[PDB]
Write a protein that binds this ligand. Structure first.
Ligand SMILES: [Mg+2]
Length: 580
DNA sequence: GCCTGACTCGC
DNA sequence: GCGAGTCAGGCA
């Protein structure tokens, strides 16, 4: 059953065809500065396996890799591109990425290897990576005969499956979406990840010194009040101290045991002095372990940078994801937490960090897709949307909007932007489910078009089996017809939410592509570093700030044209923090 | 070592 | 709600 291929000990010209399936295998989960364990090429002249030491030292082969006119089909081309970049080799000519094509067709499948993509088209002549490399501590690179057999099979799979995947994409009107958005974005993200973001480790260290000392003062206080020592970080042990020794009221339960969540503890504070200290300890400990120690661990001692990996094929919404480290959840709301952004600094001297973000892009998209007259008018006037929503659902004038009136209208808007349940809204507002439902009806009276959109979208999801975004991204909702309430409700909310959330993802992605083209046209040394959902972060020389202030907002605003304007704020400073 | 749940951050 | 990550406690 062993597939036929040539185990080459040198590169020959028939391997350098102008159309091929290419596999550049990087087995380590984190591909930055990682090894390339083997290469496989499949083309019209046959199947070949090449060793990396041979192939990546061959001037002919490396030229072929870098020749854009030489077309290549791959799975997860960003992985290969970046790993080759740490070796000083460019990858060009990728006209088809099977990971990304599988992702656009159905993100639900969770395709993470060639074998999983292949199964979609009834192709099983390839093994899953987990079956070949193993998993966990047992994860090893197998012997050359096995390795080579596996890579050729993945290449043959890519070679066979290109055509059927492009055909379905074509039928779904997702062919441009792959060739003009997702694949070009791959390249951009590859540069961003390679560039990395410079970190002030000393700053982080002296921060970790401050927390350390504070945690110790707070850890002791907790024991004194507890009258003993326990692991505060153990929900089970804390629950015994709180709810048995101190006899505190049990407000919420967990399948595991007593609930020790901040929202619960917030209400227990009045009963005992130990409660506020525990809250304080957890946030300090959250900050210390997730963002100080976690960050320091992934900083490269050589470059003194952090090189994230963006997962472009994970979410069902279409948003990018970030790992090792996740830079999309760096603390902002609390001042103690915000100061973590001071540690991110420009990669060169006399450079500054530049941040641009969309202002309420999700609500603006909603106005566009729903065509609500009132919501559209509100953004055309560039009103404070939250204050305006408070004016309508409480039937009062701007002078009359109290801070609490605005906080609650904000929560309702938030529930729409993220698709939370009425049960969700009530928990957030610390109010009854019935009142929460009352708020929503009240919002729909003020915003008839959105109500209309919610009704119509759910219906469409039921009729077609999926919902789409502005740029033709697609999400299937099988549980829409489910006869179980909670399951059906989630599916309805995802039907409502994805077109809003997904379309915003679409717009930022097209802006990244447009911005990259303009940066190049303008001959600016400025470069994309990060993407955090609503915002793009850049670094550039201070001499470019004035040009970028004008330039970067313009590109983001003109990415797509909607029925309402798009608004972008920008800032810049000596640190990411300072770009506020 | 391997899972899992419980908890918390930004969006 | 999502997604990422840390920690504990129960497991083979
Ligand atoms: Mg914003």
């Amino acid at each position: 059953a062993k597939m036929a291929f040539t185990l080459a000990d040198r590169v020959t010209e028939e391997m350098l065809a102008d159309k091929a399936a290419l596999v550049v295998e990087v087995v380590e989960e984190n591909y930055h500065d990682a090894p390339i364990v083997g290469i496989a090429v499949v083309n019209e002249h046959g199947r070949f396996f090449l060793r990396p030491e041979t192939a990546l030292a061959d001037p002919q082969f490396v030229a072929w890799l870098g020749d854009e006119t030489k077309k290549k089909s791959m799975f997860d081309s960003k992985r290969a591109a970046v790993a080759l970049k740490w070796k000083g080799i460019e990858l060009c000519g990728v006209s088809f990425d099977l990971l990304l094509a599988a992702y656009l067709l159905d993100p639900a499948q969770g395709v993470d290897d060639v074998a999983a993509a292949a199964k979609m088209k009834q192709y099983e002549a390839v093994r899953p990576d987990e079956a070949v490399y193993g998993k966990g501590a047992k994860r090893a690179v197998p012997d050359e005969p096995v390795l080579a057999e596996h890579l050729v099979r993945k290449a043959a799979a890519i070679w066979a499956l290109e055509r059927p995947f492009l055909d379905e994409l074509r039928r779904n009107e997702q062919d441009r979406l792959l060739v003009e958005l997702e694949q070009p974005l791959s390249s951009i993200l590859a540069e961003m990840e390679f560039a990395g973001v410079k970190v002030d480790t000393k700053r982080l260290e002296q921060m970790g010194e401050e927390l350390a000392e504070q945690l110790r003062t707070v850890e002791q206080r907790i024991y004194e009040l507890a009258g003993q020592e326990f692991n505060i970080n153990s929900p089970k042990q804390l629950g015994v101290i709180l709810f048995e020794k101190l006899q505190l009221p049990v407000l919420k339960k967990s399948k595991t045991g007593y609930s020790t969540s901040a929202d619960v503890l917030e209400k227990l504070a009045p009963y005992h002095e130990i409660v506020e200290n525990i809250l304080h300890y957890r946030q300090l400990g959250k900050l210390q372990s997730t963002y100080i120690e976690g960050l320091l661990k992934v900083v490269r001692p050589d470059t003194k940078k952090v090189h994230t990996i963006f997962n472009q094929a994970l979410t069902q919404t279409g948003r990018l994801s970030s790992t090792e480290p996740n830079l999309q959840n760096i603390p902002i709301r609390l001042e103690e937490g915000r100061k973590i952004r001071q540690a991110f600094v420009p990669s060169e001297s006399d450079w500054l960090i530049f941040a641009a973000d969309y202002s309420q892009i999700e609500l603006r998209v909603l106005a566009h897709i729903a065509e609500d007259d009132n919501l559209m008018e509100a953004f055309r006037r560039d009103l404070d949307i939250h204050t305006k929503t408070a004016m309508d659902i409480f039937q009062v004038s701007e002078d009359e909007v109290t801070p609490n009136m605005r906080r609650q209208a904000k929560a309702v808007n938030f529930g729409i932007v993220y698709g939370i349940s009425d049960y969700g809204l009530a928990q957030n507002l610390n109010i009854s489910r019935k009142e929460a439902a009352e708020f929503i009806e009240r919002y729909f009276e003020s915003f008839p078009g959105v109500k209309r959109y919610m009704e119509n979208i759910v219906q469409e999801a039921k009729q077609k089996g999926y919902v789409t975004t502005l740029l033709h991204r697609r999400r299937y909702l099988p549980d829409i017809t489910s006869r179980n309430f909670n399951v059906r409700s989630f599916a309805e909310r995802m039907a409502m939410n994805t077109p809003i959330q997904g379309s915003a993802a679409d717009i930022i992605k097209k802006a990244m592509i447009d911005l990259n083209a303009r940066l190049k046209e303008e001959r600016l040394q400025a470069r994309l570093l990060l993407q955090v959902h609503d915002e793009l972060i850049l670094e550039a020389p201070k001499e470019e700030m004035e040009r970028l202030c004008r330039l970067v907002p313009e590109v983001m605003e003109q990415a797509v044209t909607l029925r309402v304007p798009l608004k972008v704020d920008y800032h810049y400073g000596s640190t990411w923090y300072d770009a506020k």
